Structure 1
Amino acid sequence: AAKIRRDDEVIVLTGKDKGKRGKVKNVLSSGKVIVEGINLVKKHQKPVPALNQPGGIVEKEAAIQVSNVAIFNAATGKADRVGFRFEDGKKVRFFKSNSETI
């Protein structure tokens, strides 16, 4: 019954990234998602010799609340909301506006 999933292209509703679009890397249990090119933070990393990790400021991608991202309708070019129906006997996702399957 999970609406937003791995590899869905989404658009961002809220935050400094409002309006930007991207691809989902993974989801986390807390209801947070991590999106491509989205919500970069500059993180400071103490150099680690065991992992041969240099130091420096690494730009990384920080989790964003899944309420804030909408599943991107490529047909309409608009953010959408998602719903569930049963096609075949299988549970499937669709867009609310044009009621087309995904």
Structure 2
Amino acid sequence: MKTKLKIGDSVKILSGKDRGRIGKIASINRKKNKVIVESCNMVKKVIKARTPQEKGRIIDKEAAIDISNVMIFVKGTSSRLGIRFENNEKIRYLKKNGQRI
């Protein structure tokens, strides 16, 4: 559902296998409330991709992490996000310090 994170941001992973590893947000599945972080939660998968019999293979790809497990991380700081109204623009700022993202 509604969330304050944008595709392309850089986030730090709060919990899971990848403590504190920092990656960019590649995609957001808001039907399941999950987010895909590039080069994080990285799983091995098998694909035949089709029934005809040339070959199948093992590839590596990221799995969707829950939204709650990431937090925005900008200029060496990670914090919650509030939003402000100035210049007739709903902008975003860090609750810890309060800067332009």
The two structures have a TM-score, normalised by structure 2, of 0.87
| Alpha-carbon separation, structure 1, partners of 2:26 and 2:74 | 18
Q: Give the Cα–Cα distance (whole angstroms) in 2 for the partners of residues 12 and 26 of structure 1.
A: 15
SS in 1 for 2:84: strand
- Cα distance, 1:46–1:92 mapped onto 2, change above 3 Å: same
Cα–Cα, structure 1 residues 47 and 86, in superposed 2: closer, same or farther, change >3 Å? closer
- Decide which moves more: 24-33 or 53-62: 53-62
Aligned to 1:101: 100
2: distance between equivalents of 1:19 and 1:84?
24
Q: What secondary structure, in the 3-state scheme, does the structure 1 residue paired with 2:68 have?
A: helix
The SS at the match of 1:34 is strand
Aligned to 1:37: 39
Aligned-residue CA RMSD in angstroms?
Answer: 1.8
Q: Where has structure 1 moved over 2 Å in runs of 4 or more?
A: 47-50
Question: Counterparts of 2:87 and 2:10 in 1: how far apart (Å)?
Answer: 25
Equivalent residues in 2 for 1:1-102, closer than 5 Å: 2-29=3-30, 30-48=32-50, 54-74=55-75, 77-102=76-101
Aligned residue pair count:
98
Task: Quote the sequence identity (%).
Answer: 44
